[PDB]
Amino acid sequence: ALQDLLRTLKSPSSPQVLNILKSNPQLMAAFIKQRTAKYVAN
């Protein structure tokens, strides 16, 4: 989840990975949930 996010997200925004995460369905749901333990995705 930690590494895969970098390779998958790569540059899904380029703001001056969290970009998709802020959504919560795809990335935040699947990867953050299996790499930080205390993952928070309310």
Give the chain's domains with CATH numbers: 1-42 (1.10.1630.10)
CA–CA gap between residue 42 and residue 27 (Å, rounded): 13
CA–CA gap between residue 35 and residue 10 (Å, rounded): 18
Q: Which two tokens stand for residue 15?
A: 């703001």
Q: Are 33 and 41 in contact (CB under 8 A)?
A: yes
Q: What three-state secondary structure class fits 6?
A: helix
